[model samples]
Target: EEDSNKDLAQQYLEKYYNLEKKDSNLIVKKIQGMQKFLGLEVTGKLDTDTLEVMRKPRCGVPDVGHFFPGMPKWRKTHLTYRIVNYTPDLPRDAVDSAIEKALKVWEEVTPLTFSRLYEGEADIMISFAVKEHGDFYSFDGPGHSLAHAYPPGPGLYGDIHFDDDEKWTEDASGTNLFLVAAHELGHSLGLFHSANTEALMYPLYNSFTELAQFRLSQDDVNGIQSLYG
Candidate 1:
């Protein structure tokens, strides 16, 4: 189990934290970096707290800083999205509305506009899948990662995937699709996870009760607007 823990720590350090070194001291330093980024105590080892944070459900985008360096954003203000599939946990219409509402969260804040496609291709494609679904990053069953999205670009870029293993829902009862969609769309629009925990771009998922009144934190607004506006 100790070796397994070290493996998990090294995997996340390279994948999510963007650390590439495998040396014991180097891994410990990166673990400290993650702790600082997440506002945890700067322990230079993969202690229980550090491992706990690594295990939490988070955005798929590497948590380095505001936005990934050299990543692309939509060149045009108007973009298109297609719902390739829906989660079985909710009615199709509910899923559609939730997705639409989630995208609207960013649309209202930035100069961007989104159009939905019923056929063919789009700038963003939404789908739900369980483990090992085509992409390099597969879902780890239910609770680990509720969803993830690619940064903006062409082909497979801006695609959003939800782990169908999760109990996706439109309300507080389950993983709120709108909330997770909103967070992932932040990535879809070129925003990275914020160190500010209150921001929608923060890596961890938090249950929100007031869907009608949900608003993006100022940090999220500034991040998206800086790229597009």
Candidate 2:
């Protein structure tokens, strides 16, 4: 967690747990407890909801304001992102278009730029391959984990990989392309999940109005700015 968010988390922890140092490990445990209490899978990880609770003063939750802003200098006219389609169930172009739309969502949010690449790998890489994709985290086929990514590193080091077994769609009617992609890109830009239920970065997936599409909430803006600034 960044200083501001961390401080806010600590404040919440101090208030909720009635402590001061903000023990991250203990916080994880509490989050796990909360998840179990809420009947969600208790992975003990600091997910969007858990982080959300830590942002509130009464709830001991913090928003993205605690993190650093993105690097404005890194902004490019076109950012290259990649997508590997391993889902035999879906069309490759569908995957391609979804990824394109996802990347476009972020581009629409900020002054940043993007471009599609052919041969070489890109800063933001998208893959549909599943079942142990070289990372410590493993996909569970359909439910539970839909997608995940690594934070910005080694030149925005944004990598998004989806579970092939899961249904992917371009429109909000199904698992939205830009919605999940934007969420993953948030991680690529160093923004974590938000606890606010109405936020685009929330952990639990939900459909949003097309009218509100491609828009980042103030919290989202605050989080990204924290990372780049």
Candidate 3:
């Protein structure tokens, strides 16, 4: 009914303007957020295309696509990482390669470096969970939102938890593990999501299924470089 639709509409703003006060001129701002993120005409109202893209799920994160004040980044260019576990959908080596492929997305554009750790704490620690995974937010289950991640902080900051319920794979067979991991790690290494449809960081994920050959958009480069370069 209209109720469900409106809630979906409201998340458009929630995804972008989660910081704004409620009951203001929030409706138009919400629609505009949806339009701009989908690369529509920025109509600030429910246009045909805006409503069209509305039928999809956005990346699951409370902070939205933002780096936060002062643009918090890691203390150094070189960073260490560790994968706490692997999804049953893909093998352990598959997860390793996907994580490496994910991290390289940023390393190629910025002055960042990453080395995987088999033991000990690392800068970015990754894990896989099902629901309510002891974090600020829980995975909304499969087919809707994929996962949520932290931007940058001390503990629970750079960590990424993949909801294992989804069909994570190496290719576009299901959800591309590499693509989602790359996007999540963007949050980890200090970049927020982007409105640019051409960006892997775009709020509307799943479109990355064309990730047959995934790379960052120029907008992605701008955001990452602005923070690191």
Candidate 4:
């Protein structure tokens, strides 16, 4: 659980980009986002009912509040992306295809453009590493621990790593690479976990049919657009 109010606020800020570290204006926005996601009223204020849901750890994607009629300008931009292959844990071609499909999930949403890179600098670097992968967070073998990514920034930021111990698979029955990579790519582009179970950015893994079938829910689109817009 969160240690203090600051921790709770930080969690909200990270999960919902609308909440600033100390911006009262944005806090209302954040609360509203949380409320809508939790199936509560869209009131901007955080009442006791809203606070209760906020206390729980959000899973996939943050709520984008009420939907409006028109598409926002953020959908117009091109998003160049790349994935590095370093999955010694799985077949190289399988890992490569999984990464490509993972990225394709986001590309279908907007005018965002993407390209793959086997080497050199890439906006998103895909690799496989177990515990102590040069990050503060250490990986657990399986189950509870899946995969993680750093937010957009310099040096290893936007980098995604898979736990070598997990049974990476082409099918949904196993620990699917595309499933984990889709969530990680959310972080790579600076989005955080959403409380909604249906969101692509949910913390827990769920099976996907295939790469062509992957998609970003409306909530996922809203969260990413809020940040990148």
Measured over all alpha carbons after superposition, the RMSD of each candidate to the real structure, in angstroms, is: 2.6, 9.8, 2.9, 8.1
TM per model? 0.89, 0.63, 0.84, 0.62
Best by lDDT: 1
- Candidate 3 lDDT over 39-135, as tens digits, reads 7897776655665676665567643434243337876888888998888888889999999988888889888899889887887889988878787
- lDDT scores in order: 0.83, 0.60, 0.75, 0.64
Candidate order, TM-score descending: 1, 3, 2, 4
C-alpha lDDT of residue 226 in model 2: 66
Tens digit per residue, CA lDDT, model 1, 13-97: 8878778633567777788888888878997877888888777776666777444433568888899999998887899999999
lDDT of 2 by residue, 1-229 (tens): 6566666645544433444334558767655655564345688765666566444211111222323234423444456676644456457786676667666766666666777776577877777767787776566566445677666555425677776666766676666655777777777766666766566676556555582545677888777666454
> Quick one: how many clashes does candidate 2 have?
26
Against the true structure, candidate 3 has what lDDT?
0.75
Candidate 2: global Cα-lDDT? 0.60
Q: Candidate 4: list runs displaced more than 4 Å.
A: 1-85, 207-214
Looking at model 3, report the run of 10 residues with the lowest lDDT sum.
62-71
User: Candidate 2 — which residues are off by over 4 angstroms?
Assistant: 1-78, 208-214
Best by TM-score: 1
The regions of model 1 sitting more than 4 angstroms off are 1-7, 20-23, 65-71, 208-213
lDDT digits (tens) for residues 3-37 of candidate 4: 56546655555654445435567667666665665
**Among all windows of ten consecutive residues in candidate 1, which has the lowest summed lDDT?**
63-72
Model 4 deviation from the true structure expressed as Cα RMSD, one decimal place: 8.1
lDDT of 4 at 65: 36
